[model samples]
Structures are given as C-alpha cells and as structure tokens.
Target: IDPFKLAHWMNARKYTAAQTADLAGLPLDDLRRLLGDEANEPDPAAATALAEALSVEPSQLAADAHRNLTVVHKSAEEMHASRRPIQRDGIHFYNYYTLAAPEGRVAPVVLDILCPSDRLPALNNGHLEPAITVNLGPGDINGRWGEEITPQTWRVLHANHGGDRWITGDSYVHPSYCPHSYSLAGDAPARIVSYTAQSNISPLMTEANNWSTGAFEEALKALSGKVSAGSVLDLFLARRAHTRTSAAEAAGVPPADLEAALRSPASETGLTVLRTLGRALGFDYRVLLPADDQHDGVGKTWTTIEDSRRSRRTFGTYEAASMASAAHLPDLVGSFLRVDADGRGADLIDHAENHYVVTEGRLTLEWDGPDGPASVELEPDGSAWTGPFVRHRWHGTGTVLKFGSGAHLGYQDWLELTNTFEPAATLRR
Candidate 1:
C-alpha cells in the first residue's frame, strides 16, 4: 500500500492521524508507524479495515495501482528541478525534464537538445508514438524507419538558420518504433515538448503474448494487411457465415458485382452497393469505409505552425489551432489553445486524457475537485495533466499547448456499439 496516498485520502477527509486510527479501529501508534518513512508491510485485516473506514477500494491503495489524481499542476521551478541529463556511452546527449503525467496515459517530457552538430546524432527508439511540438529550434532532426543505426537510410530535416522560417511551433507525429534524434544547428537554444502514448498496442500485446508463435505470426500478417472496404466486408461476412452468392441474393445485387465490390477499395465501390451490402450484413454502411493513413512510407507526418488551421468556435472557450495529427488515430489530438481577457469560454468535459503546457502568460485551470471547486494558476513553462471525463475550464490571457489521447473506450468502442441498443433501453439504468 502507498502510505502517501492513504495520507492524502485522510487529509482530504479532514481526518487527523489519531482520528483516522480511531475511525479505522486501529491503535494510534500503529497507524503512525504505517504512515512513517520506514517501510512496513500492512496486515491484510488492518488494511481492509482502513480501506472500509476511508470509503475507498483496497486495490486503490496498492503500490503499483497507477492511480491518477483528478488534477495535477507542476510549476516551472518544479519541472526544472526534475531535469536530468541524458547520456549514453559517457557521451552527453540532451537534458530532459518531466511534466505531470496521468498514470497509464500520456508521458510528457521537455527535451533540451544539447548534442553538438559535430557529434553523431544520438538516435533512440521507443514503443510509444511521440507527438512533438518544437519550442526552441533552428536545429536538425534525424530519423530512420527501424532499429538499425545505418546512415544510408537516415532521413534528415534541417531547420536552418534563416529569415522568417522559424522552426518553433512545428509539430510532428512519429510512429512507434521509429528511431529519431535531434541536434542544434545554430547558437540559439533547441528544445521540444513530446507527448507520447501507446498506439493501441498495449492491450493487443497483452492478449497476443498468450498465443502460440505460429498463431501470433499469422495474426500479425492478417492485421498488417491494408484496410479497405473489401477487407471489412469479408470480416462481416465471416461473422455472419454468409457466402457472396447468398449475401448478393439477399441484397438484390448480382453475385458477380458483389464479388467485384468485395475485392475493391471503398472509393471504387458505389455508395448504393455499399448501402445494400450493409443492409444485407446488418451493419452500418460507413463501417465499410477506411480511414486515411496520413503518415508517409517512413511513418511520420509533420505540420508546421503556419499549416495549422485556427478555429474559435470549436471549443467555445478558447481559440484553438490544430496541430500535427493523424486521420487513422482519431482519438489522439493536439492543439494550441489561447484565451484572451475579452474571450468568454465555457467549461469542457473531454472524453480523453488531457495534458497542457502553458507557453505565454498565466493560464488558469479550474476543475471540480473531490471536495469542491478548485483552480490553479499556471505560469509560462508550467504544465498540468487531467484524466478523462474531468470537467475543466481554462481562463486568463495565455496560450497552452494541449495533447489528448482517448485510447481507452474511444469512439469506435462506445458510440458505434452503444447505438446498437434500443434508445429507451439505453436511457435506462
């Protein structure tokens, strides 16, 4: 059990150590010892009594539960103190600092690239897709497809010292497993804020690990195939145990035409045919359409600050400028949000886990805390993280870069499936 979390819960409930011990029917000295610096294994019966008195789940007190706070704010000073120099093979690469990250969601970091231009770029790879926003630049970026550290396949993007072509605010979405490195080109500072998340691979890997090697390899091959309308129809057909001839006869389409449509992309198939097929398969026609893959062959997409489209009406509370994004990754979103003194904005309840970094002036974050309404003022370089469905509002004249991931129970899982239920039934408890 995490004593700190237990202490926090106790404090939030306005309980003193003695009060908590009395409420949990434990000795005051025992409670104090449990909350002390010295590590102590909690007795199961005592732990259960404490949890019941605290009105919290016993699992919530687990050391590795990865429970997240409703809201977390980290100041610039705190972030600076958390900075650690990153080095490899005794060669200094860069410095990275942490931001407040929600447990099991996005991991945000600020990297100050200090590697010299003369040195070989210190390329590294990870399993999370990094959505990076350039803060200070006029730097160089090195990227490659996979794990190999070969110069032959390395692709470079130069943010050269120039007039009016600032690399700051340039954002990039890099695929998982892509190797990348950054180095400064000019005397100016070079830094970037990267928010990385698992690209729907964590849960898949958990299940895949239990499969036999041969089954795993075959499943991988099947999943790696290009997504198309035909592929989707095939899945539905298999689920319904229907042949092309039977489905075509039911839909009043020729078997030859149905077969042809099943072998073609969504764009090539007629909407009328798709609709008939949907009716025959008892599914939505739109489900057969494939989402566009925005990444290039090397699995990277870049969007400069100038390329972002600005919209004030989307959020109603802030002027939001869209950042680097992928069509296939519908749950992942990045945006630059700004609120001026004259601007009036409403509260927001997002279905995604959100992380925000203040860039200019002070940004106020207000949210409903466990006790009541609470707010925090964030200065430049300050950051915050909030879990999904937390009703929050931003006020004050400042700009914040926001990154959100809704990988858990996202659109496809909730909206599409929930609609299958009767409206009256869905409204009931």
Candidate 2:
C-alpha cells in the first residue's frame, strides 16, 4: 500500500520505463538506478536523480511488489467447480455465455445472436432447416408452446395473446429442437436453459478466456483433450452436482451451497439421477438477475453488433462488453437497457445462444406450457418483466436481444437455465 510500492509502480508503468515518470514522478536518474535489477557503482547517482524527480524519499523507491497478492476466484471457482473449458485461442466462453454477442471473433466481423422483444408480425418455419436440438435445461423438465401438460404442478400465465402457460418438475418426454424459445413472464427478467453441440471451441472464446485468467494460455493448454463440448458421456465427470431444486436448504449443509449442490443435484423423483446414471441428465431453473448494482462488471471496448438506431425497425447492438444481471430483479422489468446516453431502455433479448434474432417489435414465445413455467413477452417501448417465470424479452421499442443456444450462462461457463428465450417465429408468409 506504499506510495512507492514496486507492484504499484510496475502496474502504473505497465513494465515500461516511460511509465515510471508518469506514475511516481521518478526522474531519469533515480528511475534508471532503481530499475537496474542488478548493478553497482554510481547507482547512487541514479537514485538521487529519481529522488529529485519524485518528491518522495529516494529510499522508498525499492519497495518490493505487494507481498500479499489476493488472488480472485477463477470463473470455475466463482460459479462453482464446473466451468466451461477455455478454447484454444484463449477466449473464455463466459463472455458470451449469458448474452451471446453479435461480433463474434471480434470487430469488423460478427457472429451475433439477435432476439427481439417486440412483435414482428409472425414468422414461418417452412423451408427453414430443422433446428439442432439443444437441451440447455433437461427436456423432461421443460415443454413446448401450446404444450398441454395436465398436472397439479402446472401453472397458467396471463399472456395477452391467449391461454398460453408453462410447467416444471414434469418430464418433457420427447425433446424439442434446439434454438427454441419460451416467453418471459412476470414483472422481472426471465431465466432459461438450453443446450449446444459444437465440435471445437472457437478462437474468440479462447481469446476472451485468456483475458479472464490474465493470459492463462499455458495452464489452459495443459488441460486434457479437445473441449468440443465433449461427448454426452464426457458430461458426467464435468457435472458439478445433482439437479435438486428444493427450496429448502440442502441436507445439513449451509443454505448458501444448497443451490450450488443442486447445480448437478438429482431430483427428489430421482429422474435426474436415473437419467444421469443410465442416460444423459439435465434440469431447469428460473434465470433471474440479482438485485445489486455491485453485480455489474466493468465495460470494455464495445463494437456495434447490430444497432437498430442506425436502421429504424432494425435491431440495435454493441459488442464485446460484459453484461450480467446483478440479481434476480423481478421488480426491474420496466428498467431501461439502452447503453446510449438517451436512456433508450433494453430493446433486445437472446434465448442465450449464438444465433438469436432481434426484436422487430418484441420477441415473444415459450418452449413449454405444461412445465418449466416458461413464458416471456417484451412490451413495445415498455420495460417490465413479462412474467414471474421464464424471464424473456424486456425491451423497449427497439431493444436488441442476443440469440442462440448458449446465452445467459450460469455456474461454470455452462449456460444456466434462465427464463429467457421465448418462442419466436421467423419468415412469415
């Protein structure tokens, strides 16, 4: 904590001699002499010169780096043990985990996922290819649009459109195609879960991770084998815990780790356990942002992914900036999400994937009606949670939503089940 601390000096200097003067006002003589890691003679002259440059006592220039470096938790450690593996190029997947970016790989070119909150007439799925099925959350726990599940566990939502509803705890029975969406319900943002199946991690993913770990390339490369989301079998070892969702605190453990334990916890019904023991396992949760300003991270350089302001009726965007929900802010539904100074409010949403469509008006849709309790809707120019569960599209008139199977990531770089990604239609006839 000393004013002349070496670590402080190096950080201020970024390890360059020019920075010494900028940081401590270290003059050339003292700066050069102190900087001389190994030397002898007239070094005293150098030290005196630096002492003159910086009004501080010349003796203090030799302060060593902070003896106690408080190491922050790694992404995996922060969210629990199960972090997404970093890719080859050093990019971490978490950057786009919760919100897939538009300019993938970097600026100039983008691989954006645009999901809109407003309505855009309607789209036709005809001619479009069948979506790759990605169970961000367990299929058995989720449902599809108009999906009628008759159970005491089911809940109905007040969608302005019709009797659309959602369900949870029940099994999906059959899996739905990937890139599917659910509606955002309530007055807060919805959370959701989906899946992805790629053969190799992208370079951008690695590059971002590099920055996260302060250039952790060497350590990351030490990881075994290809991280290509791994075979379904590979997931077993990577799973952090069971899929337990008991609101009650986990058995004997502190309430804090209850959910964390449930991250890979099994169900009371034992279905998740059974599936994982004999089959692949998955589950669901309401992806809500914590209600705390401290949760917001620093904003780095942002590039335009797709800006609707530039093209009216078109989706808007900014790239590579870190955006995470502070807490599950159910009351902040109408909060503005516009990054610009005008307080434009959020006009975009993503199912939390790599290929999200933007809101022409508002992105509204849901995956299951019987279970998962997923339902989302974005008010045109109105900011508010569309529902209590399935927190989806909360955009103003032109908010741009990130789209894809890998958006809104939670614990361990794995996309956490968020009430995001509402049902949407493209290519309307």
Candidate 3:
C-alpha cells in the first residue's frame, strides 16, 4: 500500500508513534521511515508485520502482488464483446464492464458509476429486483437489486497504493436506487468484464403485483401476519396452477410441506423452500439480519461491513462499515444501557430516534447520529464491539464514525460521541 493509504489506516487509530511502534513491534525509527516514503517497498517480513497491524494483506504493500488472487470468469474483452443490445417488445438490454485498480491505487469512492460493466442495469419494470437477475450464458453480468444508483455518474478517488493505475467501483450498488441494467462508457476503458443474469418474473410475482416487491424478510413477515397457514399453501400452489403440488410430489414431499415452508420461511424447513424457489428462479438469495447490514448502499464512503473481499458491495456502505466490528458484538437483549463519562453517573437521555433492538441474538443500535443505523453482532457473553473509521461525505464536509463499544449496562463512542456510559436500569427481554 502507498504511504498515504497506509497512514490513513494507521493515524486513524489516534495512536502515538511509541504506541504504534510498540503495537506493531517495530522500532521507532523503522516505523517513521516506513510511513515516510510514498513509494517504499519494505522487506517481506516487515511488510507482513505492518500488514498485520493494519489488518490488510501483506501483498497489499507489494507493487506486483497479484499472487493468489481469485480468477474471474473471463477477461473484460471476452465478456464485453459477448453482449449485444436486445430490443424485444417494449424492452431494451445492454451490457457493461466493471473496472478494478490493480492492487495499489485510490479506488473510486461512492456515488460514482464506472464503465459500462459497473453501472446500473436496464430495468424493464420500475420495481426490479437485482438479487434475482444473475447474468446467464456466456458472460457474467452481476447486477445489484434493491439499492440507490446514479445514472451516467462518475465519482472516482485516488488511493495511491502501488500500481500505476487506480480503478475500483466494480462491485457495489447504491442502497437507494436500483438500476435495471448498465452499459460501458466510451471515455473510460479497462481490462475488466462484468456479469449479468436473466430473471424469471413468475406468474405469482409480476411487476403489476406484490410478488417482486418488498424485501424477502419484509415479505415473509407480512405473509406471516395475515396467514393462518392455509394462505401460504393456497398462494404458492394456486399461483402455480396447482402444478406445484404435482411438482412437490415429484420432488418427494407433501404439498403441505412446501406450503409449510412458505408460511415460516425463517424456520429451517420454510427457509429451504424460500431459497430453493429463489435459486430456481435465478435470484441471489441471502439472509440478512438488520436488513441494512447488506453489501450495497446509499453513499460515497470507504467502509467494509462484511469480511468477504470478493463481495462486490462489501465496502463503501453504512452496513459494511458497521459490520466490520460484528465479531465483537454479543447478546444484550435484557440489559439496560446508560451513557457516562469517567464513570460519572448520568441519565440516559431520551432521543426519540434512539433505541436498540436485539433480534435473533443480533443487536441493532443507532449511533453516528441520524445517518447511523448500525448493526452490532453481539459477542457471546462479551461486552465489546469495535468498528473501523469509515470515511463518509456529509453534504460537503467529510465525516468519520469509529464505532467503539456497548455492554450490559455500559457503552463507549470513541470517534464522535467520545464518552463511556454504564447501565442505568434493568431492561426487558
């Protein structure tokens, strides 16, 4: 990584040189020199040690460290040419390729749509679901489903890691706009191919109806609210012209079994049918707690919620940033939380917007003020959860939120609400 990016991650910790050197186990002099040069290539061992402290890959510091990288489906050229505009009855289709910087460079920030492969898809219907639209056939064109998207937009950043070129913004969708499809741009060109998939708008879920509408969990919860078990079976079986019963029989199950799954999709049995049907229809079925903890998002920021680097939407969203500390989260379902400073007692003020929920053992709390709808993964029997500094743009200014900790009756906010608090009351389960 370049000195700037490396320093960005390091100095963000609010550490002194001695503290940082001690934590990294490097000599004080070596530490300063290592971060001084914009183009310094440390020895392999030193790189590893520094990388460990920064929570990045060792090769992240190497100029030509493309080793052990996951191979994509095919090169961009091969896939780009594979797409031809499709103009069927009242429908238009196009393909775009997403670009990524080669290891070292300041990648594109948020609110930016890159080359064709990285833009939103062409939507035939206004209520299009991207998760279900996997690129089929020769080239892979993976489009994001329900999220914000900017059309013909380009917002790029310069993260000078090592490579001569900087290009990322390949794998993400804005949380608000759902672009139906995307196409490559003439101005920017890169050697990267994007993926796409065909969708099966079911007889049940049509653009004119509720089928392709709400989120999976939202839909499931709504279904549970109105059904007495018969509605689920009736809807699924009826929607399939009663053929699903015969299909279920062919698939080796009681017709009621499939219906049962539809009724309680959160359950092991029901979720199976929920996902099985999605897969059969080419939808990227995923189960997310605190729904916002997903990959794609609404703004321009460098934050990672999920740990999977391969995930396109893993970085640059509120969800990804908050989830970075998921491992430190633990159960606090039946505890009261109070805010304090220096162990001095203080009443937890009532903010109409401030409250938390613990569902399925996951905690959903709001910090970072209005923009923060954070999900804290509760560590079993533990009381600490910490998040990294996610650089986000606020109107015209830049803001950072470094999520710190929450416990049975105590809490801490290191970055913004820099204070610690303790429990003030016994909370309900």
Root mean square deviation (Cα) for candidate 2: 22.0
lDDT of candidate 2 vs native? 0.28
- What is each predicted model's overall lDDT from 0 to 1? 0.70, 0.28, 0.34
Clashes of each: 1, 139, 58
Highest TM-score among the candidates is held by which one? 1
lDDT of 1: 0.70
Q: Which stretches of candidate 1 lie over 4 Å from their true place?
A: 1-69, 103-106, 128-130, 136-167, 263-269, 282-285, 293-300, 309-317, 342-344, 414-418, 422-428
lDDT (tens digit, per residue) of candidate 1 on 44-146? 5487878888889987665654444688888988888988998964677878998877555445889887766556565676555645544435465544444
Across 33-109, the per-residue lDDT of candidate 3 in tens digits comes to 76764334465437777778767786665544542222111222432343444553334443332222223421111
Instruction: Report the lDDT tens digits of candidate 2 across residue range 1-429.
Output: 133353344554355656555554556455455444444523444444444444445566653332222111112122222223422223221212322222222111111112222311122122111122211211111212222333322222211121101111111111122122232222322222221222123445556665757457644564445332112223433464543332222233344443333343333433233333332233232112112222111121111112112222312532211112212221111111222222333333332223332223443323322344343443321111111122322222333323223213323233422223532221120
After the best TM-score superposition of candidate 2, give how far the Cα of residue 147 lies from its true spot, in angstroms. 36
Clashing pairs in 1: 317-345
Model 3, which residues run further than 4 Å from truth? 1-170, 173-177, 180-194, 202-230, 234-306, 310-429
Q: What's the best-to-worst order under lDDT?
A: 1, 3, 2
On TM-score, the stronger of 1 and 2 is 1
Highest lDDT scorer: 1
TM of each candidate vs. truth: 0.73, 0.19, 0.21
